[PDB]
Amino acid sequence: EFVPPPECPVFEPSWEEFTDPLSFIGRIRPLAEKTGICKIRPPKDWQPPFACEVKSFRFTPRVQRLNELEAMAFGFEQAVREYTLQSFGEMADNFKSDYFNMPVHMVPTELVEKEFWRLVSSIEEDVIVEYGADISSKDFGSGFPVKDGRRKILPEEEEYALSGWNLNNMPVLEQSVLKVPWLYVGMCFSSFCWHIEDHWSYSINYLHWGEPKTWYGVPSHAAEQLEEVMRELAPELFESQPDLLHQLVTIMNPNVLMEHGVPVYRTNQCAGEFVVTFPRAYHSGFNQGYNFAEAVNFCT
Ligand SMILES: Cn1cc(Nc2cnccc2C(=O)O)c2cccnc21
Numbered sequence: 001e002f003v004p005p006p007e008c009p010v011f012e013p014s015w016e017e018f019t020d021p022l023s024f025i026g027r028i029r030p031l032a033e034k035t036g037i038c039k040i041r042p043p044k045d046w047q048p049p050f051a052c053e054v055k056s057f058r059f060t061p062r063v064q065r066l067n068e069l070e071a072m073a074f075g076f077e078q079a080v081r082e083y084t085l086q087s088f089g090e091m092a093d094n095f096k097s098d099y100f101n102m103p104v105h106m107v108p109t110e111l112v113e114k115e116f117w118r119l120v121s122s123i124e125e126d127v128i129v130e131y132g133a134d135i136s137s138k139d140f141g142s143g144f145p146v147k148d149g150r151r152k153i154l155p156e157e158e159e160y161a162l163s164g165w166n167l168n169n170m171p172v173l174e175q176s177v178l179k180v181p182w183l184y185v186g187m188c189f190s191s192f193c194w195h196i197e198d199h200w201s202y203s204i205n206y207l208h209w210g211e212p213k214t215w216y217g218v219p220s221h222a223a224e225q226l227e228e229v230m231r232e233l234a235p236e237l238f239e240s241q242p243d244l245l246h247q248l249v250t251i252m253n254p255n256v257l258m259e260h261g262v263p264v265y266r267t268n269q270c271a272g273e274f275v276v277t278f279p280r281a282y283h284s285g286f287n288q289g290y291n292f293a294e295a296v297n298f299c300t
């Protein structure tokens with residue numbers, strides 16, 4: 001069965017260290033850049049409200065067939081449904097509780113992880129899920145409060161609208177001679193395959209609420225090694241594809257990378273926790289259940 005990779009670093013900054021995100025990320029860099037990803041738990045009393053327009057939040061998630069690569073009237077597999085945040089959560093909880101035959105919060109994270117990777121390589125069982133991925137924060141607002149006048153800000157919420165850890169306040173303009181956060185409404189087994197960011201950018205990721213998001217990360221010093229293992233084992237039909245396109249279907253069991261000498265670290269990002277990916281740190285993951293994440297690429 002699946003062997004969980006070693007855990008990535010988790011930092012619990014004090015209020016003093018939590019003052020400046022870029023300063024903190026710069027200070028943890030000697031360790032975190034050697035693991036590719038890391039997790040940051042804010043101080044206990046740092047609890048931003050959820051600021052999306054929930055009444056009007058509507059979206060059509062994308063269908064994900066977990067074993068599509070292994071499986072190589074097709075094209076009309078599933079029927080698309082539009083959801084609200086509530087109706088998607090109802091669907092997501094019903095799927096998970098039916099699949100595991102237990103209440104959603106009782107399913108061990110290790111079991112969802114083991115079952116996810118079994119399903120990815122299974123030819124005898126076709127599991128299909130839906131992912132509300134890459135919803136722009138312009139559509140229904142950011143999950144963080146933003147002082148743009150579109151939604152009321154309470155006095156006790158203003159500090160979060162001005163916080164440097166508010167993803168809308170991360171720097172995004174790269175220096176050159178010559179960008180807003182994105183939202184992810186997850187369900188059990190919804191996933192993102194191995195990739196790096198455009199321009200080898202850092203990314204920061206915040207789980208607003210819900211069940212955890214499970215991550216895998218590879219340090220940048222092993223980026224070429226991972227790409228080598230990909231070219232060896234990825235389908236021949238997608239081998240010659242440019243990286244930007246190949247990254248749409250670069251799903252690979254972490255144990256396969258580990259067996260080929262590639263260092264891989266994991267974490268369960270829980271509600272209220274940040275995940276930072278360092279430059280050229282390949283990462284991939286899946287959601288344990290119904291959750292809501294916000295992410296943005298930033299520069300230092
Ligand atoms: C472009 N894009 C980004 C996705 N998701 C992530 C990317 N990087 C880090 C985290 C995530 C996440 O899903 O939490 C994604 C999932 C499905 C299709 N397209 C996607």
Ligand SMILES: [Mn+2]
Nearest residue numbers: 195196197203
């Ligand atoms: Mn990413």
